[PDB]
Structure formats: C-alpha cells, structure tokens
Amino acid sequence: IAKERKLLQNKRLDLDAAKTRLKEFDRQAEIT
Amino acid sequence: IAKERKLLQNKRLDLDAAKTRLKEFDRQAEIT
C-alpha cells in the first residue's frame, strides 16, 4: 500500500507536467 | 519538419517507457 501510494505520488506530478505542456497515472492510481 | 520529427523522437521513447511500465506520441506523430 505504501509502495503503490509512493508511486502514485510520483506519477501524479508526471501526469500534471504532461498535461500542462501542451503544443502512467491511471494504472498506478487504480492499484493505489 | 525538423522540429516535429525532433519532438517525435523525444515522445516515442516516452510512449515506450509509459507502455512498458505496467502494473503524447499520437499528436506529435500526426504532425510529423
């Protein structure tokens, strides 16, 4: 549980930095 | 053309590293 939430807190900022820079959050959030 | 293929060669490895790590390739590939 700690590993999956630790990787969720890693991949949430990756999703946010991906979706902000216009011109794996989902699976990690699912297991968490 | 060089900018779009340079960003395609950046985002293809991002798609591959996203899809390999189980448990924006498309738009960049489209413009390229």
Asked if A24 has any chain B CB less than 8 Å from its own CB, the reply is yes
Q: What is the DSSP string of B1-32?
A: -HHHHHHHHHHHHHHHHHHH----HHHHHHH-
Q: Do A27 and B24 touch (CB under 8 A)?
A: no
Given resolution (angstroms): 10.0
Q: How many CA atoms lie within 13 A of B25 on its CB side?
A: 9
On whether any CB of chain A is under 8 Å from the CB of B18, the answer is yes
For residue B22, the chain A residues in CB contact (below 8 A) are 27
How is residue A19 written in tokens? 């979706």
The count of residues in chain A is 32
Over its C-alpha atoms, chain A yields an Rg (Å, rounded) of: 10
Indicate the burial class of A28 (C-beta count within 10 angstroms; 0-12, 13-18, 19 or more).
buried
Separation in Å, CA of A16 to nearest CA in chain B: 13
